[PDB]
Design a protein around this ligand. Structure first.
Ligand SMILES: O=C(O)C1=C(c2ccc3ncsc3c2)CCC1
Length: 166
């Protein structure tokens, strides 16, 4: 949990312009959050990047989880191994608003972070999920009460978030 170069947004939310995969390799946090889907198929975005950094070990493990437990629900989560990136990976499903999934579920997705004291995480429902990233940061700030270190890869997006926030 040796986080460096973050800007403190609120008492418990920090932000950095960084690749979450590289942050995970440097820090080796207790928990890294994955922006997952209900079947834990890590095909792109943060999910594909995190899976790729474990050389597909996260996917093989996720397939076994789904066969034994069934899919997650939108707004839900599960804890699996963090492999070489972290002690644990908290897979969290935010709503895919481009597929008509309710934005009210973005609050439920962020509530999952509260079961862990410190997390390294991406913004939820950003990218292909289609939610407004600045709105996603507002829900995170209103909902998360534990210590969250947000990593945002795209510098144009990071700059828009920091500008809107401070
Ligand atoms: O820039 C980001 O914060 C965002 C994404 C992303 C995509 C690929 C990727 N590979 C390594 S870190 C990473 C983040 C998807 C949407 C938001």
């Amino acid at each position: 949990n040796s986080f460096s170069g973050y800007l403190k947004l609120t008492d418990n939310v920090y932000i950095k312009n960084a690749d979450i995969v590289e942050e995970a390799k440097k820090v080796k946090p207790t928990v890294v959050v994955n922006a997952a889907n209900v079947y834990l198929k890590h095909g792109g975005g943060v999910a594909g990047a995190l899976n790729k950094a474990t050389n597909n070990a996260m996917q093989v493990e996720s397939d076994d989880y789904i066969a034994t437990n069934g899919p997650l629900k939108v707004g839900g989560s599960c804890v699996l191994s963090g492999h070489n990136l972290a002690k644990h990976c908290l897979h969290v499903v935010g709503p895919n608003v481009n597929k008509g999934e309710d934005i009210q579920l973005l609050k439920s997705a962020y509530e999952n972070f509260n079961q862990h004291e410190v997390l390294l995480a991406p913004l939820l429902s950003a990218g292909i999920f289609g939610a407004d990233p600045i709105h996603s940061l507002r829900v995170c700030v209103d909902t998360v009460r534990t210590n969250v270190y947000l990593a945002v890869f795209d510098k144009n997006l990071y700059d828009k978030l920091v500008s809107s926030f401070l």
